[PDB]
């Protein structure tokens, strides 16, 4: 299936993502990964959300994990954003096919009907595709608030040169196209 709902499990959540990026950079066995999250309680609380944040980062490599763990607030959040895009065609295609064209308006906005109608299109496009839907929409817009794209008025956001260099150097065509749409 082209579009899946996994992205709805949680927004970028930088603080937690930094801890997970640490664990990725240290190197632990899978059993130890689960122990650190669930028993040692490294996130200071469950399981599904941490799997998502990890699955997101594991689409990318140590260089970007190091950015998440060590970088400034904006650099780290944007690296997490790129990972979220790579992990989710549903998010990436929202950016690519809807958000990008909105920035053609004067005073671009992104009202919820636009998400609704995008989902209508996604269904059309993917023959293999309530409470989940609502949490889903909320999560996508929260991501966009976190990165700074969102009156539902849209604003342009400059992706850090450090993140963009990583993406170019790693051939991340699709993330590149979706991450910068302003």
Curated annotation (Swiss-Prot):
What UniProt keywords apply to this chain's record, in alphabetical order? Answer: Antiviral defense
User: Tell me, what is an example of a GO biological process annotation in this record?
Assistant: defense response to virus
Leader sequence range is none
Looking up Gene3D superfamilies in the UniProt record yields: uncharacterized protein from magnetospirillum magneticum domain
Keyword Cell division attributed: no
InterPro entries, per database record: BrxA, BrxA_sf
What does the UniProt function comment say about this protein? Answer: BREX systems (bacteriophage exclusion) provide immunity against bacteriophage. Part of a type 1 BREX system which protects against dsDNA phage. This system allows phage adsorption but prevents phage DNA replication, without degradation of the phage DNA. Methylation of bacterial DNA by PglX guides self/non-self discrimination.
Family, as annotated: Belongs to the BrxA family.
Which named protein is this? BREX protein BrxA
